[PDB]
Design a protein around this ligand. Structure first.
Ligand SMILES: [Zn+2]
Length: 46
């Protein structure tokens, strides 16, 4: 079988990291935050 979800309508802005679109650009940039913040190192135990 093969299935997949997709947004309803169309937006000028879209997130190419997870797949979340937003009518406005202010609703996208504030969302991409979840894709930017962590660190590849983290709390190093010396
Ligand atoms: Zn996203």
């Amino acid at each position: 079988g093969s299935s997949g979800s997709s947004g309803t309508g169309e937006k000028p802005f879209k997130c190419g990291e997870c797949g979340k679109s937003y009518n406005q650009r202010v609703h996208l940039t504030q969302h991409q935050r979840v894709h930017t913040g962590e660190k590849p190192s983290g709390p190093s135990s010396g």
